[PDB]
Amino acid sequence: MLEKFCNSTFWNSSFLDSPEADLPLCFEQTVLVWIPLGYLWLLAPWQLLHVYKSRTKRSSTTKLYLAKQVFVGFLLILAAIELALVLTEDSGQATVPAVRYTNPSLYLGTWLLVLLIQYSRQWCVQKNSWFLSLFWILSILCGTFQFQTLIRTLLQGDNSNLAYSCLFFISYGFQILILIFSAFSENNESSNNPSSIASFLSSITYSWYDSIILKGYKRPLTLEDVWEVDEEMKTKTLVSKFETHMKRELQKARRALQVPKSWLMKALFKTFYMVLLKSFLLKLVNDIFTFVSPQLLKLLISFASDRDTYLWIGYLCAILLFTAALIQSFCLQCYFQLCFKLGVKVRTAIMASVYKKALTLSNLARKEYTVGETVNLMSVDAQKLMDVTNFMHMLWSSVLQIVLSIFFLWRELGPSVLAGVGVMVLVIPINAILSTKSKTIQVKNMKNKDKRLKIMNEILSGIKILKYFAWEPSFRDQVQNLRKKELKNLLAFSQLQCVVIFVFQLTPVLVSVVTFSVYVLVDSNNILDAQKAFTSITLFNILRFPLSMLPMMISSMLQASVSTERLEKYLGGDDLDTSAIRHDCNFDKAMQFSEASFTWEHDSEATVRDVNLDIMAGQLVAVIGPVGSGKSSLISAMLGEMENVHGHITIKGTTAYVPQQSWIQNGTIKDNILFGTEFNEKRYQQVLEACALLPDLEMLPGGDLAEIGEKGINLSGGQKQRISLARATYQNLDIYLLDDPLSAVDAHVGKHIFNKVLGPNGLLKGKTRLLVTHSMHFLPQVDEIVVLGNGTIVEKGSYSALLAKKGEFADYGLISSVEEIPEDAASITMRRENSFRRTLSKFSIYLEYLQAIGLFSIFFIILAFVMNSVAFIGSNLWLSAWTSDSKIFNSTDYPASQRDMRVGVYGALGLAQGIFVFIAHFWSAFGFVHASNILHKQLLNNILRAPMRFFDTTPTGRIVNRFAGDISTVDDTLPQSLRSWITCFLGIISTLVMICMATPVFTIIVIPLGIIYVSVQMFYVSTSRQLRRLDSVTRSPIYSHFSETVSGLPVIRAFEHQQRFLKHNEVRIDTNQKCVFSWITSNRWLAIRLELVGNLTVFFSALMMVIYRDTLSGDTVGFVLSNALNITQTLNWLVRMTSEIETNIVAVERITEYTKVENEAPWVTDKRPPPDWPSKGKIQFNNYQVRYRPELDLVLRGITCDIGSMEKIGVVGRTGAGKSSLTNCLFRILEAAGGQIIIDGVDIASIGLHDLREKLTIIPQDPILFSGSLRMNLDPFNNYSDEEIWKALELAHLKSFVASLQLGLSHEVTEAGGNLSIGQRQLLCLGRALLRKSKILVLDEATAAVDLETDNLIQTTIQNEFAHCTVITIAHRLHTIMDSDKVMVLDNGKIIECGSPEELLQIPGPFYFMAKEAGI
């Protein structure tokens, strides 16, 4: 072809048929040099015009840019020298070939272009791009052959082309060096985030993320240490981009109504097709290159089989086994980030779009959804869309992989392959049947789980009563009975989990048995050979994942079809209509009702009926009417929240509104006051003083910076009403709407605010005030009063105008998709579903967990697992010996006995691998369940044994969250992950042993490949663990914020703060985006580094086979290379589990922390008091001291007192009375410091608590009841009969009530006695004390909050029934101790006066001075 061009042959096939095979010189110097040259001139204008599109300010000329510019200048010099050398030299006898000087011409031309673009790249933000990085990469691979050809030719002594050779070597060396400089990013401070400044070789490698990994590992990582997301990923841009497509296409869907449906998906696709297209043209590259590894394996096996194949075939088939894997590696991760980033980019387009719809949504469309049913609309109902939008491509890519794998397998084995794929297909119904069976059992368990929470909250909140009455053994067995019923069901779930795992784990070795046995037995001449044997095993490790993860792509995709419907309904709702209410400035006065009629819903009566009313913009106006008759709707009428049927409302200026129920945000109390406007010291002091928040402010700890809201300190209705009024006043608006501002405030307090805030001289003189109330306290000062009747006004006038005329009417994080780890993609999906059900409602730690597991059972389980690896090793090794039969035994000469022997042994080895892996998982379930039985029991014992001091310090909510919100982790997620870790760490070890037994020298290479693997795992775990908790801590505020704005939405529209609240969500969502995307790259940084090690393991193994080809048999390379191709996927899988195990193991450590809590004195000691010990009340003090905390101070200073039988002891005090301390004193609740108290000749310290505690009675101030029933509440052990219980109820006068109940004692008591009134609950505690019938009664303010009639009843019952028992009474008021035989006075831990109240009153004493003559 190029005879007139090259003067030599273009291509001779004989050149490649020799051991010293070299490409023809003409072919390399022309064809392979145009591919890089043609790559530029074809695409050079495009990358030039696109650069010209973004004309920005050029950065300073960096040193690196100059170096990569002068060096290319040398290439211009070298190319020019070569052209001049060829032409200026005198040789005309032989005409120069065209190739000799034409090639410099393009090199002269192309380097001129490179000089131009490299300078023009400065204007762009990214100093390097795929246009130059690929060209340098492509000009080295194509130019390598010339470098090899010239070097080999020069080594032969032919120096005819020495001048060209030396110039080419320098040109080749500089191109390699230029590539090095092209991988370095020139810092120009365009943005703090390096993603937009990273060079191309640093953006398909993620070396720009190295800074965080290095920074995170050293010191703890914090929010400000993570760079903000790219400008495109910003939530402000995404909402606007999604808004245009949503609004234009929703109207199209509205036209089809002549409720819109099937409209959300058609909008999302039209908005992100530019990202979808880039993930489709690039996914095919991964699928095409994933079948190269098996196809290249056949070539390498054939090379080892024959001793005639040339050496260069092997090396070229080993380099290609690394290049075709690097391209697959870099492209696959460049797709994972290009598609997971779409998941984050689609949730933001919905999470930040529901909020904007929430403000504008009509309440009529909000009536159906509750508060909880709206908060979950994006925490679960929109997070369902991530997983669907995370990896859609398996809807088409999985179909492609199974269809292509079948074709390749059918091309190598024959029709018998259909039987093999049939077995894997038949697994899918087994998986589906087991999955839907496990879900039924799991969800049926959630009802028993939540019941334990209800009791668990119940026990801790009220442990004081539990310690007093010593009832905790009864509840301990009550919870254990519930837990035992729980654990019996849990074990069945674990059994169903050791089968799905066993079926899925065994399916790659069962298909091999079926496929090979049928192939060899169907026909005699079908001999098995290593070329067609191991090319099938490695294909079964490729087809397995698409055909096992496909069924979840049907359930999950269908699971979004219902989740989309809820999102479809909400976004499609009709927004509120503001045509009824007008805002204008031309209007003179403030208010105007033009025959307005209003109704709550369309199918309802009009609450407002045809009223004309006008108000001047200068006075206070109040509205008075009967409660529940067209009154509460009036305030909402001038707000846009209320529906209109016929009317015309106009309002001038801003409006301020105060609701009946108070909506309060979380944060400091200052934010709820200023409302995010400003902070004026003079104004702030005015509203705070006028609104009288000072009597509260000194009471909340932290002063004005207290944590208000559910997060911190809750407030009563009265304080909440004041805050809402204070917020409105500070805003300083025009019109104020008051809706019962003084409904729940104190009467005297209500006097204070009315006069000075909104009265004759209040700060609101210049602002109109509309007020509604039913209390007749203050309406003499109101400028104008309007009386409503039948929903309309009846009389208008002031108090003296017309009213005086008559006056008669007045988890799962770090795994974005199951695609990243297809080794076990099933257990991942169940883990997310466990989390979704939830949201709808160092080495010493491992040993501690393993000690909970039967340690004897551990050594057998690990023995079964390691024996499984041996069987796997034996099976593959035996298969290698089987394929050796083809060489020795000719076709049609294969003995039938030998054929039957081969399959028979392989069948048994398919069973030794089967019967052992099942006996390990099956025994894993019986062990992991037993751990939960022991671990939970330890917590329920020590915690119930914990001192009252322990509960006082730590919050109650902390313990509960660690009782079942943490136990769920140790027995749903931890057991399944651990059994899925050792089953893969034994895959890496098994694979490495396989290679080491073929080429022993390879084990040296393991050490560099072990240090790298450990270092990468160590770095990633030390960082991604921090990045996991840092996401959860910042994800919760988004959902928490939405609950506070959907509930307080009517207030928001009153102040027109919609725009401010939207911006609050933009920053709040963005802070989550900068964290979710922050580990996605951190997850990709694992894959590239580890697949680089996985590729190096395979590449360095193929060289060992190639080099040691004289001794290695052809079939031996099969089981060494077929099982090594799976090391790439297993290697990154192993590290991910180690991250999740190391994160979920903190749950066990937290449990152990409370299990080690210091424990009180033994319940039962060697001394048991006789029944006559509580027979008489002999209480004596011996200078006893008490201490709340062993380090603060001494509460008691050695009180000494003698108490005889029938001594009505009255103990009183003002400050530090120790009345609480005395209750903890007599019952051994606290520790004994310097004294002791002797009872009936026996010291309390000697007696065991449980025997001691039961023998006295106590009535707590707070009557907390129990949720079981009344029968168990009165008596947990229930040793008493029904007649005694009925008599006790009669004694407490509950007989008439309980007998009138539904079933009496069998009545279902709700939480905290929610079905019983406060006065009712205060009578149960008397019955509880009545049942004891013991001589000692300790009282502690049981009548501080009871009515007088019941108060007289309560003491009389104590006076009458316990007239035969010693009673010690504690009362804050001295009006209940005149009936006391002995009255005790003490202050700050020291007794003041001793004596009866009769003699105490005669002598003027300190208690007489402060309580009798001054307190009376």
Side-chain angles (χ1 to χ4, degrees):
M1 189 165 3
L2 317 179
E3 163 37 12
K4 281 320 187 302
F5 202 127
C6 270
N7 170 270
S8 89
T9 67
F10 181 47
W11 198 11
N12 186 3
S13 311
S14 66
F15 268 94
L16 294 175
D17 279 344
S18 295
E20 52 272 28
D22 288 280
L23 270 193
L25 190 131
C26 164
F27 174 74
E28 153 58 14
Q29 300 247 40
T30 69
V31 152
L32 295 193
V33 83
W34 300 338
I35 289 185
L37 257 283
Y39 166 81
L40 257 64
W41 294 86
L42 209 170
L43 269 77
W46 173 40
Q47 299 304 98
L48 231 45
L49 261 45
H50 157 273
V51 156
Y52 206 45
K53 199 171 260 192
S54 308
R55 284 307 307 265
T56 69
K57 176 73 169 87
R58 75 210 323 281
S59 72
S60 169
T61 66
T62 50
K63 198 87 163 144
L64 268 306
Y65 158 82
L66 202 59
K68 68 198 289 281
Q69 200 81 268
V70 52
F71 255 128
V72 190
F74 288 33
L75 251 54
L76 216 31
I77 281 316
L78 288 183
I81 285 181
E82 149 179 316
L83 181 43
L85 169 36
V86 152
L87 267 275
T88 53
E89 68 94 14
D90 200 281
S91 71
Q93 297 82 12
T95 52
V96 296
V99 47
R100 181 92 209 200
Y101 64 59
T102 36
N103 271 295
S105 168
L106 319 90
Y107 266 14
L108 270 274
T110 205
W111 287 153
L112 261 47
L113 205 148
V114 164
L115 261 306
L116 164 155
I117 166 178
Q118 208 133 316
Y119 149 94
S120 163
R121 205 71 234 200
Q122 261 190 356
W123 296 345
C124 155
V125 48
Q126 212 189 11
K127 308 307 194 330
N128 298 76
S129 43
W130 62 271
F131 190 49
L132 290 176
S133 271
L134 251 73
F135 160 61
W136 292 131
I137 284 283
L138 199 136
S139 160
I140 302 314
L141 303 197
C142 292
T144 296
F145 297 141
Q146 194 148 325
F147 181 47
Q148 169 275 339
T149 297
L150 264 304
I151 273 281
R152 253 65 204 191
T153 296
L154 215 81
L155 281 193
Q156 305 297 348
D158 166 42
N159 312 102
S160 65
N161 291 326
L162 183 161
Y164 181 45
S165 314
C166 191
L167 291 213
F168 192 84
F169 296 135
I170 312 194
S171 164
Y172 193 82
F174 277 31
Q175 279 160 94
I176 271 288
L177 192 143
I178 280 303
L179 179 33
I180 299 302
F181 283 160
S182 282
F184 282 173
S185 282
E186 288 158 16
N187 65 92
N188 78 322
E189 315 318 295
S190 285
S191 69
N192 76 280
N193 181 327
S195 176
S196 211
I197 86 162
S199 41
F200 179 80
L201 284 181
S202 287
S203 166
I204 70 180
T205 285
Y206 297 115
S207 191
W208 64 262
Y209 199 70
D210 193 308
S211 72
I212 272 155
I213 293 306
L214 152 65
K215 200 174 319 295
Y217 156 72
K218 294 184 292 179
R219 44 103 169 181
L221 210 169
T222 314
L223 267 165
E224 318 81 315
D225 217 337
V226 179
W227 318 300
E228 291 286 14
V229 282
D230 269 309
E231 184 47 52
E232 166 58 30
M233 274 259 266
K234 289 296 216 260
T235 172
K236 170 63 88 178
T237 296
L238 293 180
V239 164
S240 85
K241 249 176 60 186
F242 173 80
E243 207 74 280
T244 70
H245 295 94
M246 171 175 108
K247 94 203 176 299
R248 83 169 50 249
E249 158 290 335
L250 185 47
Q251 294 297 321
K252 186 186 293 180
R254 283 252 176 75
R255 303 297 312 285
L257 215 35
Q258 287 72 59
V259 170
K261 37 175 183 53
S262 66
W263 74 267
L264 181 73
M265 260 317 184
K266 297 165 37 73
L268 283 171
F269 159 70
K270 281 182 183 176
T271 323
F272 297 83
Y273 60 84
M274 197 42 111
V275 180
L276 273 195
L277 180 50
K278 277 194 272 290
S279 50
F280 174 99
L281 309 170
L282 189 151
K283 183 70 152 80
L284 282 180
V285 153
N286 168 46
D287 272 6
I288 290 307
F289 273 61
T290 206
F291 291 118
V292 178
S293 283
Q295 211 191 352
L296 256 50
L297 210 184
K298 255 172 46 58
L299 274 312
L300 188 147
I301 281 302
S302 174
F303 155 68
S305 177
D306 309 0
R307 298 283 171 77
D308 179 76
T309 57
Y310 321 107
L311 204 30
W312 71 266
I313 273 164
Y315 293 73
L316 193 133
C317 261
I319 290 296
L320 259 294
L321 201 41
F322 178 59
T323 283
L326 263 193
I327 296 302
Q328 192 256 11
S329 194
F330 287 179
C331 277
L332 173 66
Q333 317 303 331
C334 202
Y335 150 77
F336 274 158
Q337 191 179 38
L338 211 47
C339 204
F340 296 160
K341 214 172 66 179
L342 190 76
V344 182
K345 214 185 296 180
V346 76
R347 196 192 51 179
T348 291
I350 278 183
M351 271 185 48
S353 182
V354 166
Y355 200 164
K356 187 201 287 190
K357 182 66 172 183
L359 302 184
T360 59
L361 188 85
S362 88
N363 43 25
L364 165 66
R366 199 188 62 247
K367 282 202 281 283
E368 308 84 335
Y369 313 80
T370 74
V371 161
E373 269 183 347
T374 313
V375 179
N376 69 344
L377 190 60
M378 65 220 169
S379 41
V380 46
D381 304 330
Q383 183 146 341
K384 226 97 80 183
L385 253 65
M386 221 186 268
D387 293 28
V388 155
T389 36
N390 246 339
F391 63 126
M392 302 75 68
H393 279 326
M394 293 334 88
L395 261 206
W396 73 266
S397 165
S398 270
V399 152
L400 192 136
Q401 277 212 7
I402 87 167
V403 86
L404 222 51
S405 286
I406 284 304
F407 165 60
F408 272 30
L409 262 202
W410 197 38
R411 202 197 186 159
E412 301 337 282
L413 261 166
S416 68
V417 72
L418 265 302
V421 74
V423 152
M424 253 164 38
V425 152
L426 257 67
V427 155
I428 288 326
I430 305 300
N431 265 320
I433 273 165
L434 262 283
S435 177
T436 207
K437 176 65 155 280
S438 45
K439 291 322 177 53
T440 286
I441 271 179
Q442 157 181 130
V443 86
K444 193 199 64 55
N445 188 260
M446 220 44 105
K447 71 171 103 161
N448 286 320
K449 166 68 63 62
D450 165 279
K451 283 197 287 184
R452 181 167 93 264
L453 285 321
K454 288 293 298 305
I455 310 307
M456 251 328 306
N457 294 337
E458 191 215 10
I459 293 157
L460 302 189
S461 50
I463 178 64
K464 261 312 212 182
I465 294 169
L466 264 298
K467 203 59 73 72
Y468 284 161
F469 303 358
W471 290 346
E472 81 279 346
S474 302
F475 303 80
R476 178 197 69 181
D477 316 344
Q478 199 278 334
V479 179
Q480 280 191 5
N481 284 316
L482 187 48
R483 181 79 163 139
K484 187 248 285 182
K485 192 156 89 55
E486 211 285 339
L487 279 191
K488 180 177 71 68
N489 153 258
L490 182 52
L491 205 171
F493 172 53
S494 281
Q495 304 276 31
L496 271 43
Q497 278 301 290
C498 87
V499 179
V500 47
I501 272 287
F502 149 77
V503 159
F504 175 74
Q505 195 274 347
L506 168 138
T507 194
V509 80
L510 177 63
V511 56
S512 163
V513 172
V514 166
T515 288
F516 284 124
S517 324
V518 187
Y519 168 58
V520 64
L521 281 159
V522 59
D523 196 3
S524 44
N525 40 335
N526 292 340
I527 61 200
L528 202 60
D529 193 358
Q531 310 119 34
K532 60 173 65 173
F534 292 86
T535 201
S536 167
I537 282 285
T538 185
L539 274 185
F540 280 134
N541 272 302
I542 277 178
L543 158 76
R544 172 160 56 105
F545 306 142
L547 211 63
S548 75
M549 106 177 54
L550 197 64
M552 89 184 32
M553 276 334 280
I554 288 329
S555 82
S556 280
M557 162 75 218
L558 187 31
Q559 204 95 341
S561 199
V562 57
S563 153
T564 302
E565 185 90 349
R566 320 157 76 150
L567 269 295
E568 184 149 83
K569 267 174 49 60
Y570 200 66
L571 268 69
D574 36 358
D575 86 278
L576 88 167
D577 53 332
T578 176
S579 50
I581 296 177
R582 326 308 172 58
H583 290 359
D584 54 347
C585 168
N586 317 114
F587 185 38
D588 44 359
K589 33 194 170 180
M591 282 305 80
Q592 164 154 99
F593 311 145
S594 296
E595 292 328 338
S597 52
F598 287 122
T599 192
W600 289 93
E601 65 267 59
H602 213 177
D603 40 40
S604 203
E605 314 312 317
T607 321
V608 193
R609 292 112 177 172
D610 187 48
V611 50
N612 267 338
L613 202 140
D614 273 0
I615 294 149
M616 301 325 148
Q619 70 278 31
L620 174 45
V621 174
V623 180
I624 171 66
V627 289
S629 55
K631 198 178 200 175
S632 180
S633 70
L634 208 29
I635 321 94
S636 288
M638 311 71 48
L639 299 178
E641 159 278 348
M642 162 46 58
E643 276 70 11
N644 182 11
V645 55
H646 159 242
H648 174 280
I649 308 282
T650 176
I651 299 183
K652 161 152 101 184
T654 64
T655 66
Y657 153 99
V658 176
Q660 178 82 256
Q661 81 295 350
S662 282
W663 160 80
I664 300 310
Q665 324 186 12
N666 38 314
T668 81
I669 220 174
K670 205 166 304 307
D671 326 292
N672 267 263
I673 288 302
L674 326 161
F675 216 61
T677 65
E678 269 101 4
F679 174 62
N680 190 2
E681 188 57 84
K682 183 49 196 315
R683 282 304 310 284
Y684 186 87
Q685 286 295 333
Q686 277 186 356
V687 279
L688 263 296
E689 179 55 73
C691 201
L693 263 301
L694 298 324
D696 282 333
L697 254 297
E698 90 312 355
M699 161 295 298
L700 318 87
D704 230 11
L705 291 288
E707 191 58 288
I708 183 51
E710 330 300 307
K711 288 313 291 283
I713 282 270
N714 74 300
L715 307 211
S716 166
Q719 324 160 284
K720 263 205 202 143
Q721 279 209 275
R722 290 201 281 284
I723 275 277
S724 294
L725 206 185
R727 183 182 39 212
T729 49
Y730 186 91
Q731 289 319 299
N732 195 63
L733 308 184
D734 303 335
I735 298 154
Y736 291 61
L737 301 212
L738 282 37
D739 166 37
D740 247 0
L742 309 184
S743 65
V745 303
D746 161 77
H748 172 237
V749 162
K751 304 209 295 177
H752 179 240
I753 294 96
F754 178 88
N755 288 334
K756 66 188 329 182
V757 174
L758 62 178
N761 48 6
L763 67 160
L764 306 155
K765 277 320 288 174
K767 327 295 166 61
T768 60
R769 339 191 192 82
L770 197 140
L771 187 179
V772 295
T773 185
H774 193 93
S775 156
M776 305 94 88
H777 56 301
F778 294 28
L779 295 174
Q781 201 266 329
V782 184
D783 180 273
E784 204 277 326
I785 292 170
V786 167
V787 180
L788 56 85
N790 185 254
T792 194
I793 68 154
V794 286
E795 175 265 332
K796 153 151 31 174
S798 312
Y799 215 171
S800 42
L802 259 184
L803 271 81
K805 182 178 183 292
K806 312 177 309 303
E808 51 94 23
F809 48 93
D811 208 338
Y812 182 73
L814 310 210
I815 296 312
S816 54
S817 156
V818 316
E819 191 146 280
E820 334 187 32
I821 40 177
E823 208 287 324
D824 188 12
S827 166
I828 290 327
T829 285
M830 283 53 101
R831 268 163 36 78
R832 144 181 300 281
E833 300 282 3
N834 284 339
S835 166
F836 266 13
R837 267 154 171 89
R838 190 250 292 186
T839 170
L840 258 297
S841 301
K842 282 288 188 178
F843 171 78
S844 74
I845 298 319
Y846 286 108
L847 164 156
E848 180 49 51
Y849 184 40
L850 259 63
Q851 280 281 359
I853 292 282
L855 206 185
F856 165 89
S857 186
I858 281 286
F859 159 91
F860 280 32
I861 287 179
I862 191 84
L863 174 164
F865 268 124
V866 69
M867 192 135 74
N868 165 43
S869 156
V870 160
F872 188 43
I873 272 181
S875 162
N876 274 235
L877 166 138
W878 165 267
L879 178 60
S880 189
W882 186 9
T883 36
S884 81
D885 268 8
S886 75
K887 302 296 169 62
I888 47 172
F889 279 92
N890 191 2
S891 67
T892 71
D893 298 332
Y894 207 29
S897 66
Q898 193 73 254
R899 187 179 95 266
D900 211 25
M901 191 275 258
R902 286 320 163 101
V903 286
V905 179
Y906 195 41
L909 284 188
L911 259 291
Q913 190 166 345
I915 211 66
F916 283 161
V917 73
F918 146 83
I919 212 67
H921 290 96
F922 189 89
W923 210 348
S924 158
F926 272 114
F928 280 149
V929 161
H930 163 263
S932 193
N933 207 340
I934 273 280
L935 214 48
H936 174 66
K937 175 198 310 303
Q938 293 303 75
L939 255 196
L940 196 50
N941 261 0
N942 210 73
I943 281 197
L944 219 62
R945 264 301 281 221
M948 192 46 257
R949 182 221 58 71
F950 158 78
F951 294 112
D952 262 357
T953 58
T954 59
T956 293
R958 193 191 307 279
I959 320 286
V960 152
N961 177 292
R962 310 246 308 275
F963 223 86
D966 173 298
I967 277 282
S968 170
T969 279
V970 81
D971 82 3
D972 320 329
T973 88
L974 205 64
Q976 183 54 330
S977 293
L978 269 162
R979 87 166 48 159
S980 184
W981 184 95
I982 196 43
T983 199
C984 276
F985 174 64
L986 258 53
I988 298 311
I989 287 269
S990 169
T991 297
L992 249 64
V993 152
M994 245 163 221
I995 301 181
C996 283
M997 83 160 44
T999 64
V1001 317
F1002 165 80
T1003 191
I1004 294 332
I1005 305 309
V1006 177
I1007 301 309
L1009 294 196
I1011 296 310
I1012 287 188
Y1013 154 79
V1014 160
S1015 169
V1016 175
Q1017 163 183 343
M1018 199 265 278
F1019 272 170
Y1020 161 87
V1021 160
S1022 164
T1023 285
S1024 179
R1025 173 187 65 194
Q1026 314 198 350
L1027 206 45
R1028 193 174 187 195
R1029 69 149 185 79
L1030 200 143
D1031 168 41
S1032 283
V1033 77
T1034 194
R1035 178 191 285 164
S1036 179
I1038 310 172
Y1039 313 132
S1040 176
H1041 172 88
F1042 191 41
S1043 75
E1044 96 170 14
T1045 175
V1046 67
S1047 52
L1049 162 63
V1051 168
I1052 310 310
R1053 308 199 247 205
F1055 296 87
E1056 297 113 321
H1057 271 80
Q1058 309 168 351
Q1059 290 301 325
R1060 199 266 316 261
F1061 261 118
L1062 296 186
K1063 184 53 42 163
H1064 259 84
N1065 210 82
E1066 310 300 7
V1067 49
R1068 209 154 299 190
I1069 272 182
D1070 247 14
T1071 323
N1072 174 40
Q1073 256 202 246
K1074 85 191 201 68
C1075 303
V1076 163
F1077 168 79
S1078 186
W1079 82 76
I1080 280 181
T1081 87
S1082 202
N1083 234 5
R1084 309 281 80 78
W1085 190 66
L1086 259 193
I1088 294 189
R1089 303 331 181 101
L1090 288 200
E1091 272 185 20
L1092 204 37
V1093 193
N1095 271 12
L1096 252 57
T1097 279
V1098 154
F1099 165 80
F1100 273 165
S1101 147
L1103 254 65
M1104 291 325 198
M1105 322 285 128
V1106 158
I1107 291 172
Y1108 292 167
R1109 78 187 282 262
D1110 56 351
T1111 170
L1112 272 191
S1113 67
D1115 46 356
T1116 288
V1117 192
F1119 87 117
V1120 187
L1121 207 54
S1122 166
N1123 301 340
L1125 257 54
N1126 300 155
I1127 212 159
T1128 68
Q1129 196 275 340
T1130 317
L1131 247 182
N1132 94 315
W1133 156 277
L1134 175 61
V1135 170
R1136 298 274 266 283
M1137 300 315 79
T1138 318
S1139 76
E1140 311 216 320
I1141 293 285
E1142 200 78 341
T1143 295
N1144 289 359
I1145 210 60
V1146 317
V1148 176
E1149 140 76 0
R1150 289 202 295 238
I1151 286 178
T1152 294
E1153 211 164 279
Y1154 279 148
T1155 326
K1156 215 75 58 61
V1157 160
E1158 215 284 357
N1159 176 44
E1160 320 171 31
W1163 283 358
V1164 181
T1165 60
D1166 76 309
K1167 157 62 167 182
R1168 263 81 74 192
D1172 296 334
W1173 175 89
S1175 60
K1176 291 216 61 67
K1178 305 303 297 175
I1179 324 299
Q1180 166 73 66
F1181 282 41
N1182 312 115
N1183 318 282
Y1184 181 49
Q1185 294 80 351
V1186 82
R1187 192 154 193 172
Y1188 276 13
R1189 217 77 37 77
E1191 80 271 3
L1192 317 181
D1193 59 271
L1194 263 69
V1195 194
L1196 259 200
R1197 322 109 55 90
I1199 294 295
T1200 291
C1201 179
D1202 180 73
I1203 310 167
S1205 192
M1206 271 314 326
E1207 263 270 78
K1208 321 298 284 282
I1209 290 281
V1211 165
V1212 280
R1214 174 192 190 179
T1215 309
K1219 300 164 155 141
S1220 45
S1221 310
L1222 284 161
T1223 56
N1224 314 40
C1225 171
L1226 298 174
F1227 282 176
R1228 203 111 88 87
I1229 310 305
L1230 304 184
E1231 77 71 24
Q1236 52 95 5
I1237 296 169
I1238 187 160
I1239 317 296
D1240 201 74
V1242 193
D1243 188 3
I1244 48 177
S1246 68
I1247 318 144
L1249 312 94
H1250 266 230
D1251 209 350
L1252 152 61
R1253 288 256 174 73
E1254 172 37 30
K1255 288 172 156 214
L1256 320 93
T1257 83
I1258 192 165
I1259 306 74
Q1261 185 161 207
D1262 44 283
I1264 329 306
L1265 329 181
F1266 293 133
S1267 293
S1269 76
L1270 301 116
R1271 171 92 76 157
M1272 51 75 58
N1273 206 354
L1274 278 168
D1275 192 4
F1277 301 96
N1278 210 101
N1279 42 6
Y1280 303 170
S1281 57
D1282 165 61
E1283 47 270 29
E1284 295 179 352
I1285 285 154
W1286 270 128
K1287 178 178 62 44
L1289 287 169
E1290 216 146 32
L1291 280 146
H1293 307 103
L1294 291 143
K1295 184 29 186 164
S1296 292
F1297 170 18
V1298 174
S1300 76
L1301 277 176
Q1302 163 74 94
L1303 257 192
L1305 321 173
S1306 313
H1307 192 193
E1308 214 30 55
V1309 187
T1310 49
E1311 69 300 333
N1315 291 7
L1316 277 70
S1317 81
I1318 286 328
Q1320 279 154 238
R1321 302 176 205 177
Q1322 213 84 50
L1323 280 185
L1324 287 284
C1325 52
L1326 284 82
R1328 289 192 274 194
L1330 274 154
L1331 260 63
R1332 300 294 163 269
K1333 328 205 185 180
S1334 58
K1335 265 293 303 300
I1336 314 104
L1337 192 173
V1338 197
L1339 185 31
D1340 196 1
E1341 280 273 88
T1343 55
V1346 84
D1347 55 292
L1348 281 313
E1349 182 178 355
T1350 313
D1351 200 327
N1352 305 324
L1353 198 154
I1354 282 162
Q1355 343 313 310
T1356 296
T1357 292
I1358 297 146
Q1359 281 144 25
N1360 286 37
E1361 205 275 341
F1362 303 90
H1364 73 124
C1365 304
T1366 309
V1367 182
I1368 296 166
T1369 65
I1370 282 302
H1372 170 35
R1373 42 181 286 173
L1374 281 76
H1375 315 99
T1376 72
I1377 36 165
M1378 294 300 293
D1379 53 349
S1380 279
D1381 313 338
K1382 174 75 173 65
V1383 164
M1384 259 335 277
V1385 191
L1386 93 169
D1387 258 5
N1388 315 85
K1390 191 51 64 202
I1391 50 184
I1392 300 306
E1393 270 169 342
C1394 324
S1396 68
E1398 286 87 11
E1399 67 199 30
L1400 273 187
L1401 202 140
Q1402 304 320 303
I1403 175 167
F1407 97 98
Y1408 192 98
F1409 301 143
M1410 69 191 186
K1412 186 48 74 195
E1413 71 97 19
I1416 177 64

